[PDB]
């Protein structure tokens, strides 16, 4: 899953 930013 990708980081928030």
């Amino acid at each position, epitope marked *: *899953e*990708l980081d928030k*930013w």
Partner: antibody
Framework: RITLKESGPPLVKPTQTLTLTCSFSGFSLSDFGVGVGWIRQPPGKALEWLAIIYSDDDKRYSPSLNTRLTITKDTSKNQVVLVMTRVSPVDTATYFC????????????????????????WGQGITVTISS | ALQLTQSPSSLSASVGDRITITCRASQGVTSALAWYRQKPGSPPQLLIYDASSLESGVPSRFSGSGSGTEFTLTISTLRPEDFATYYCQQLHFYPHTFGGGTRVDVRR
């Protein structure tokens, strides 16, 4: 100046629940993009990422620790809490909480997002041992 | 998950030496990478954020380069406080992986 500090019990027995508290100052978890994360360090070992929570209450956990962790924040009393259910001696480590900058905002806008790529300020850390 | 391998694990050096540590990701992490120095008894200290951005307060002898899967940390002139352990961290993916660390001790 930003500061974070970990508080909680130095000893916990196996199967028990560990509640760690991160009290900070110098920033608010109502501030844009800001996050507070937890990282532990077993005696003599590498850092292990545990979780992070942001000002919008967005939460992320370590996949391997997921079922046992709960992260939460109290915006009003600058406190981020980490609850770790049913611990074992492997949970024995130094627990750090740390600040993560949010994107740079210019008036309205986010011109810069490179600053989120790090945990810039860390707390002293708290040592927790798990023994029955 | 995502793998952060540091090289080398241990490094022998002397004051004034120029050293370089590398952090290798199993998948591209763009520029979302941080370097930290940790002295025994103390918490990690941010040196480099966003792969190359020098953190405020940190000495200019610290430098970071690379993107994607290859990252390097360079200490141009080793000072006594650099005899410590270094860590890299990836913040492009969850979970925010840390490398295994690189111990820098006094060479003899």
């Amino acid at each position: 100046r930003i500061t974070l500090k970990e508080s909680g019990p130095p000893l916990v027995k196996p199967t028990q629940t560990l509640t760690l508290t991160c009290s900070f100052s110098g920033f608010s978890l109502s501030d844009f993009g800001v996050g507070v994360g937890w990282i532990r360090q077993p005696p003599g070992k590498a850092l292990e990422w545990l979780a992070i929570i942001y000002s919008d209450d967005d939460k992320r956990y370590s996949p391997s620790l997921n079922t046992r962790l709960t992260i939460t924040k109290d915006t009003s009393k600058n406190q981020v809490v980490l609850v770790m259910t049913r611990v074992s001696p492997v949970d024995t480590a130094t627990y750090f909480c740390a600040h993560r900058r949010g994107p740079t905002t210019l008036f309205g806008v986010p011109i810069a997002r490179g600053p989120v790529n790090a945990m810039d300020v860390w707390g002293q850390g708290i040592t927790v041992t798990i023994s029955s | 998950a995502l793998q952060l391998t540091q090289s080398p694990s241990s490094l022998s050096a002397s004051v004034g030496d120029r050293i370089t540590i590398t952090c290798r990701a199993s998948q591209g992490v763009t520029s979302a990478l941080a370097w930290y120095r940790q002295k025994p008894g103390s918490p990690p200290q941010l040196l480099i954020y966003d792969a190359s951005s020098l953190e405020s307060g940190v000495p200019s002898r610290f430098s970071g380069s690379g993107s994607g899967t290859e990252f390097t940390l360079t200490i141009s002139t080793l000072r006594p406080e650099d005899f410590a352990t270094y860590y890299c961290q990836q913040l492009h993916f969850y979970p925010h992986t840390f490398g295994g660390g690189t111990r820098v001790d006094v060479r003899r």
